[PDB]
Structures are given as structure tokens and as C-alpha cells.
Amino acid sequence: QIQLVQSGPELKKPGETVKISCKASGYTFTNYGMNLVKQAPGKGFEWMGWINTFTGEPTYADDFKGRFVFSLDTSASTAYLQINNLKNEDTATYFFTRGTDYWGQGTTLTVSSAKTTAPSVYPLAPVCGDTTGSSVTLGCLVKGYFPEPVTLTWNSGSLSSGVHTFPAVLQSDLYTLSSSVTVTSSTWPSQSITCNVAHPASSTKVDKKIEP
């Protein structure tokens, strides 16, 4: 049960600051050092530097020895990455790693003078296929939101098998995402299928019942 859990998604304006955190659990925090990794959109992994979890002394790679601060809270097995004077270039997903083998689920930070925009969630119901294969595919459409990311599930997680969540796409300045789910023609409208969606940035969270 060696896990590293990072703080939620972030949306900040240029010049603002952020303090992303990570919590270790499952191993002796101060016996392994931690690394920090960046990943801009579409790009590869960029090593930001590391933290001696024993000494607490941080080390920044040449590009981050300017506006980045790495710190700890030994007692809580928690490391913090603070970025000051944010710039559009800072937009990316940051990771913490225990040495070189374990990563956190990541943390997506977005920096832009663009204001948040909740996403409009639309259900999606059949019309074609019915029982020529016996399966039925329902969907859900989340469009026109900003920034990334949005969280979606079916029936608050209970329905995870046979589901397909496609990567968000960029519009003018809004992301649209889609997701499908397939079940046996019988179980619907037999059972109730609901689409769960949350757009952290907009402190939003919506659900949509799907019907014929």
C-alpha cells in the first residue's frame, strides 16, 4: 500500500502562486528521496529537481532554480511544490515520485487570464441499434468547459465496466469531452443510467439521467 496522493487540479492567473502537495503512505518517508517532474501538454517528462526528505534540502534543475520552491512537513510525510509568479509556460501536470519507482496520480495546473467556464452536460440516447446485437450503447456529452480537467463517472462509479471516456478536445478556448457506455438491451431503460460529471475549476458537479 505504497501510495502518493497529490492535491487537486489548479487554475491560476498569471503572476499568482500555487502550492501543490503530495502525501506519502506505505513506506518510511525519510529513507527515500523525492523527485519532481513536469509534463507540459503533449510534451515529455521534465525533471524539476529533487528533495532530500532527510535533510529537507531541495535541489533545483537549472530551469527551476528561479521561481520554484520545494519543501516538506516531515511529520505528515508530505512534500510541497510551490510555484511563484506563475506564467503561461507553467501550464502542465506535475508529479512527485518516491525515488525513481513510484509516482503520484499527477496534478494539473493551468495558468491563463481566461475565466472559468462550467461545462454543459448533455445526455445521449439511442435511435438506431436495438437488438441486432442485443447490446445498447448510451453516451454522455460534456462540452464548452475550461480549464482542464473534468471528472466523469457512471452511476457514481458503480458502472465502470464497458465504458469509454475519450480525451478532451480543444475548441475556440473551451474543451469538449465525450464518454460512452454499453449494456445489455434488457438492463435499459430497465435500470437507471446516470452520467456523473464534475469540473473542479468551476466548483461544478452535475448528473444526467439518460432516457429514450
Partner: protein, 102 residues
């Protein structure tokens, strides 16, 4: 963390004996992955050799694991085991050095 802690000069790793050819063959085949120098506080700041050595071990070993895993390691129960020993002999040898100089 390491305030007041010194890095002693390098020294040959002590040849410790672990009866079985294997676990013994392990140390010889894995000692490059172990330290060959120790962190410590001035020998005077301690009442005896035991306090000193005990502090030196925890500091050396730990410092060693955090700075190496940072680059990419994996210290198993055996790695830690064979290390406490090795580092302990080294810390004691460090004690002689330091004391021998006071």
C-alpha cells in the same frame, strides 16, 4: 538533518563474514551499492563510542538511501541488513580515527 555532521575520509569496506557462501557472496557482489565513508558529529560531542557509532549509522545509512534512491535504487531487507553491519564497523573505525586525533 546533518548540521554538525562531517563526512569522513573514504576507507576500505570491512570484510564481514556471513557463514553461508551465498549471503556472503551477496555482500561482495553488492558492496559497490554501499557506502565507504561516514557522516558523524565531532567525536567530543559524545560520552562514549556507543552513542557516537549509533548516531553515525542512522545518519550514514539514511543519508545514503535517500540520496541514492533519488537517482534510482532499491534497498531490500538484506541490503539494509548487510549495510547496518558494514556501516557500523566503519563508524567504529571512524571513532578511532577521530578520537586518535584528539
Amino acid at each position: 538533518g546533518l548540521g554538525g555532521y562531517m563526512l569522513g575520509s573514504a576507507m576500505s569496506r570491512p570484510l564481514i563474514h556471513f557463514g553461508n557462501d551465498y549471503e556472503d557472496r551477496y555482500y561482495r557482489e553488492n558492496m559497490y551499492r554501499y557506502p565507504n565513508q561516514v557522516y558523524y558529529r565531532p567525536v567530543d560531542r559524545y560520552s562514549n563510542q556507543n552513542n557516537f557509532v549509533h548516531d553515525c549509522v542512522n545518519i550514514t545509512v539514511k543519508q545514503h538511501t535517500v540520496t541514492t534512491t533519488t537517482k534510482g535504487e532499491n534497498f531490500t531487507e538484506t541490503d539494509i541488513k548487510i549495510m547496518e553491519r558494514v556501516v557500523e564497523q566503519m563508524c567504529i573505525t571512524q571513532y578511532q580515527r577521530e578520537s586518535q586525533a584528539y
